[PDB]
UniProtKB/Swiss-Prot annotation:
Protein's recorded name: Profilin-1
Top-level taxon: Eukaryota
Phosphothreonine carried by residues: T103
Quaternary structure note: Occurs in many kinds of cells as a complex with monomeric actin in a 1:1 ratio.
Chief localisation class: cytoplasm
Organism: Betula pendula
Gene name of this polypeptide: BETVII
GO terms of molecular function: actin monomer binding
Family membership noted in the UniProt record: Belongs to the profilin family.
Subcellular location: Cytoplasm, Cytoskeleton
Residues spanned by motif Involved in PIP2 interaction: 73-89
Function: Binds to actin and affects the structure of the cytoskeleton. At high concentrations, profilin prevents the polymerization of actin, whereas it enhances it at low concentrations. By binding to PIP2, it inhibits the formation of IP3 and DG.
């Protein structure tokens, strides 16, 4: 099915590809439903680094503490044992959520791999 191909190719606790406009292109079975305001805040942080830091990154209501990202290209957050990685591409956002014992470096690897895939196609 569309969902198995997706899960099978975005997996990581959850992953997702969403347009800069907030539309969902693909999301894993366990990815959270989120609010547009959550996407606006992230988009502003790719523009003005450090923008989310003061309030934390929220996604599907979950609060992630912002940590060292890649200015204007990748954002990272910590939550208890796991965290999140978000990479901005020409037209989308690649989201990667990890949990113990997956490592931040492992999540980063997958989000970057997906980013390369989309940028390669002009997305």
């Amino acid at each position: 099915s569309w969902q198995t191909y997706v899960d099978e190719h975005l997996m990581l606790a959850a992953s997702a590809i969403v347009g800069h406009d907030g539309s969902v292109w693909a999301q894993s079975s366990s990815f959270p439903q989120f609010k547009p305001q959550e996407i606006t805040g992230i988009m502003k942080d790719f523009e003005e680094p450090g923008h989310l830091a003061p309030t934390g990154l929220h996604l599907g209501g979950i609060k992630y503490m912002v940590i060292q990202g890649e200015a204007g290209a990748v954002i990272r957050g910590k939550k208890g044992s796991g965290g999140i990685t978000i990479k901005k591409t020409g037209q989308a956002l690649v989201f990667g959520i990890y949990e113990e014992p997956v490592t931040p470096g492992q999540c980063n690897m997958v989000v970057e791999r997906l980013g390369d895939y989309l940028i390669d196609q002009g997305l």
